[PDB]
């Protein structure tokens, strides 16, 4: 599955509330301040991932390669740019940090490619 | 479940029989320790609306001497027993000529009927017990030493020998699970024999307060 985002109203720019359609049996997000209706996209209006299957590559930014305080390795080349040097670090996050998973970020400028071993 | 229910009922029956035997009642030897299979054959092996339902295993036991008094045990059908339900037991109780009786409740028993149980203590004594209390014979636990109820003559002998009054003895709660197991009333000294690692054996006494 996937996460669900908060829908926004078009007139008063508030957040839309899901509701059911009594005649067409479809789900509709409805504003409460004004009366604005829209055709919903997916049946999943709520989701809850509890098993912390949190991919970390999205949270890792390419700017971290500029940090002098991180360890460097000439042992793992970049997959995209082929740069032989890349830095590595832990997950750096709560709801995590139970497994020692290394995350690699290529230090080559203007590439910023990141991956996990 | 059904096998779990009949196992629980057999355990409750075993503990009740052991309680009656330890209290000084006429307990038949095989009834004192019967096999789960024996209980299942004797009662029906289907408590879930079947032969071994409640009110069928109301155990009537008399005293070892002076067999007039009995506390034929009760097993209410409903989990939360109440005043209008214990009045049926009271009617059956007055139908006989005895005063003591025990009930084995399933869930928490109502405070109004709790007060009611005290409300006829001088007339006829009623004790209550929850199911989890009668799934284990606490007297068999290694932490619980041998509790023995003392007769009035023995209590007088003790007080005259030690030249002390009933007030000076160490006391025991009336709601003590051991006291409830023996069903001892207020003002009834209970000798306790426990092993001592510095003297071998040590006998203490606990008055009921």
């Amino acid at each position: 599955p996937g996460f669900v985002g908060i829908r926004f109203c078009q007139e008063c720019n508030n957040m839309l509330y899901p509701k059911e359609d009594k005649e067409n049996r479809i789900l509709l997000y409805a504003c409460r301040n004004c009366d604005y209706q829209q055709e919903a996209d997916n049946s999943c209006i709520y989701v809850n991932k509890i098993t912390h299957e949190v991919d970390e590559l999205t949270q890792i930014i390419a700017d971290v390669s500029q940090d002098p305080t991180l360890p460097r390795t000439e042992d793992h080349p970049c997959q995209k740019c082929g740069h032989k040097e890349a830095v590595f670090f832990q997950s750096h996050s709560a709801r995590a940090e139970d497994a020692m998973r290394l995350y690699y970020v290529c230090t080559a400028p203007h590439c910023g490619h990141r991956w996990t071993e | 479940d059904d096998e779990e229910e009949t196992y629980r009922l057999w355990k409750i029956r075993k503990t009740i029989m052991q309680l009656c035997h330890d209290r000084g009642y006429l307990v038949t030897q095989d009834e004192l320790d019967q096999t789960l299979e024996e209980f299942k054959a004797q009662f029906g092996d289907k408590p879930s609306e079947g032969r071994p339902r409640r009110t069928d295993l109301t155990v009537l036991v008399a005293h070892n001497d002076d067999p007039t008094d009995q506390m034929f045990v009760f097993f209410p059908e409903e989990p939360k027993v109440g005043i209008k339900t214990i009045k049926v037991y009271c009617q059956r109780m007055q139908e006989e000529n005895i005063t003591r009786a025990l009930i084995v409740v399933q869930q928490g028993m109502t405070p109004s009927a709790k007060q009611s149980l005290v409300d006829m203590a001088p007339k006829y004594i009623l004790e209550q017990f929850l199911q989890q209390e009668l799934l284990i014979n606490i007297t068999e636990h290694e932490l619980v030493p041998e509790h023995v109820v003392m007769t009035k003559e023995e209590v007088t002998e003790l007080l005259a020998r030690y030249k002390l009054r009933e007030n000076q003895l160490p006391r025991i709660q009336a709601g003590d699970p051991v006291a409830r197991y023996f069903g001892i009333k207020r003002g009834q000294v209970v000798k306790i024999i426990r092993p001592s690692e510095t003297a071998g054996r040590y006998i203490t006494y606990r008055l009921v307060q």
Binding site: T69, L70, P71, F89, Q90, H92 | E157, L158, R161, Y162, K163, L164, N167, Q168, L169, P170, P195, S196, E197, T198, A199, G200, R201, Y202, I203, T204
Partner: protein, 248 residues
């Protein structure tokens, strides 16, 4: 109780690289006090010492409040002249002090020989088999040897005391389910026997000269003389029996 925490962002000191779980980075000191500690190790050694002093400084206040509660709770518990333990309001706490009436100064750790033999080992070491001739010849003088062999009443008594030992052996195993016998008792019997041996110049190579019936009678008389609870009524007799049950 654990290694040096990451005080900084995922590093114990700014001198180590981030996410360094190595020995030196997390506080292990490989040097000795003779070689001296590196500055990173010296600071980490200060980490442990500061924890020790903090424990020492805080323990005093919390512990100090404790004994005051204990003493003020039991500042009137004493032993009355009937050997019983009563509080200020004459409520008996223990019928005898320490469940035996023995003070805590004149007791020693002793080993119960009756506990932890095998059944055959217990019988081999305690039964005093009188049927063997040569064993009696070596242990006792010949006048005593024929006295034991001829009379059967003495043989009956020696059998009866062993019966008490098996009864005692079962009692100890009930009292001590754990297989240990390091128990505190007032009189160090083994030492006094060894004290008696050196005083009287035994030379245990020679056969002894005491009648075993004197040993049985002497012990029984001695047990009567050791009185914790006076009186003659069976209630006091049971208390006296229970008070010196382990010692007897």
């Amino acid at each position: 109780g654990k290694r040096i925490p990451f005080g900084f962002k995922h590093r114990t000191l700014p001198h180590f690289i981030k996410d360094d779980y190595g020995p030196e980075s997390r506080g292990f000191v490989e040097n000795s006090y003779l070689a001296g500690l590196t500055p990173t190790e010296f600071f980490f050694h200060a980490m442990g010492g500061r924890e020790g002093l903090i424990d020492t400084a805080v323990k005093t206040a919390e512990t100090g409040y404790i004994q005051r509660r204990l003493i003020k709770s039991m500042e009137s518990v004493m032993v009355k002249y009937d050997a019983t333990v009563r509080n200020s309001i004459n409520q008996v706490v223990q019928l005898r002090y320490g469940e035996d009436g023995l003070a805590g100064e004149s007791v020693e750790f002793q080993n119960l020989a009756t506990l932890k033999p095998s059944n055959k080992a217990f019988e081999k070491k305690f039964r005093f088999d009188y049927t063997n001739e040569r064993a009696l010849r070596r242990t006792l003088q010949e006048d005593l040897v024929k006295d034991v062999l001829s009379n059967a009443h003495i043989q009956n008594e020696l059998e009866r005391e062993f019966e008490r030992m098996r009864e005692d052996r079962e009692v100890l195993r009930v009292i001590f389910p754990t297989g240990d016998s390091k128990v505190v008792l007032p009189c160090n019997l083994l030492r006094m026997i060894w004290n008696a041996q050196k005083i009287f110049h035994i030379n245990p190579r020679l056969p002894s000269d005491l009648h075993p019936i004197k040993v049985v009678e002497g012990v029984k008389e001695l047990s009567k003389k050791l009185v914790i609870v006076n009186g003659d009524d069976p209630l006091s007799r049971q208390a006296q029996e229970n008070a010196t049950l382990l010692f007897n």
